[PDB]
Each structure stands twice: as C-alpha cells, then as structure tokens.
Design a protein around this motif. Structure first.
Motif, PDB file in Angstrom:
ATOM      1  N   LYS A  15       6.152  53.651   5.564  1.00  0.00           N
ATOM      2  CA  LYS A  15       5.791  55.020   5.907  1.00  0.00           C
ATOM      3  C   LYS A  15       6.350  55.377   7.263  1.00  0.00           C
ATOM      4  O   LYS A  15       6.525  54.515   8.127  1.00  0.00           O
ATOM      5  N   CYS A  16       6.631  56.657   7.451  1.00  0.00           N
ATOM      6  CA  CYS A  16       7.179  57.107   8.710  1.00  0.00           C
ATOM      7  C   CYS A  16       6.679  58.492   9.035  1.00  0.00           C
ATOM      8  O   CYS A  16       6.379  59.287   8.146  1.00  0.00           O
ATOM      9  N   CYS A  17       6.596  58.774  10.321  1.00  0.00           N
ATOM     10  CA  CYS A  17       6.086  60.051  10.783  1.00  0.00           C
ATOM     11  C   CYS A  17       7.215  61.074  10.930  1.00  0.00           C
ATOM     12  O   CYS A  17       8.135  60.886  11.727  1.00  0.00           O
ATOM     13  N   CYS A  26       0.369  60.452  14.149  1.00  0.00           N
ATOM     14  CA  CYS A  26       1.438  61.328  13.702  1.00  0.00           C
ATOM     15  C   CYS A  26       1.009  62.786  13.850  1.00  0.00           C
ATOM     16  O   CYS A  26       0.055  63.216  13.203  1.00  0.00           O
TER      17      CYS A  26
ATOM     18  N   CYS B   5      13.804  58.864   7.538  1.00  0.00           N
ATOM     19  CA  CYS B   5      12.465  59.204   7.060  1.00  0.00           C
ATOM     20  C   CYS B   5      12.509  60.361   6.080  1.00  0.00           C
ATOM     21  O   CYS B   5      12.813  61.488   6.459  1.00  0.00           O
ATOM     22  N   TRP B  14       3.459  62.573   7.075  1.00  0.00           N
ATOM     23  CA  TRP B  14       3.943  61.215   6.803  1.00  0.00           C
ATOM     24  C   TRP B  14       4.917  61.240   5.658  1.00  0.00           C
ATOM     25  O   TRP B  14       4.627  61.807   4.605  1.00  0.00           O
TER      26      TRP B  14
END
Lengths: 46, 49
Positions: A15-17, A26, B5, B14
């Motif tokens: 997962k990434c913000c 986040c 992302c 997210w």
C-alpha cells in the motif's frame, strides 16, 4: 515514487499514500504538508 | 521500498504498489522475475519457480 509498505507477509502488492505521507499518516488531500511536535499530522489548505 | 503508487478507486488516499517488479500491468511473484512478451497474450513475468 512513494514509499511502498507491506500489507501481509508474502503479498506482492503493498500500500502507498497517494497524497502526502506524514510518518504513518496519509493526508486527506494532496495540498497538505507535515507537522511534527498536537502530535504529528497533516496541515492542509483551508 | 519505493515504488510507483497506483490509485484503486476515486476518493481513496491509499493506493496500491507492486513490491516486486512490474511488467507493464503485472506484479511479478518475485523481485528477481524478469519481463517477457507473449505473442497474443501480452506482457508478463517469467520467474524462477
């Protein structure tokens, strides 16, 4: 391009913000910067 | 790690990111996989099983 964090041991998708990451938080929007001291958090345009 | 992302759905802050290796759209089973092109099937990973 952004930190990629593991979700479960073994999973290849993390997962990434997408906005801004302030330590573990986040931010609600992209136009936020980070504050630290209360507590760490997001400072966003009003 | 640090990675591209990808957004999953509108409104969500997210996203998702491939911890291994991305072969165009495909997130490979292992970081040491490499990318191939399969005729008629497109981009994919080739990995040590």
């Amino acid at each position: 391009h952004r930190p990629c964090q593991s979700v479960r041991p073994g999973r290849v998708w993390g997962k990434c913000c997408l906005t801004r990451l302030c330590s573990t938080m986040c931010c609600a929007r992209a136009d936020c910067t980070c504050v630290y001291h209360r507590g760490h958090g997001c400072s966003c345009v009003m």
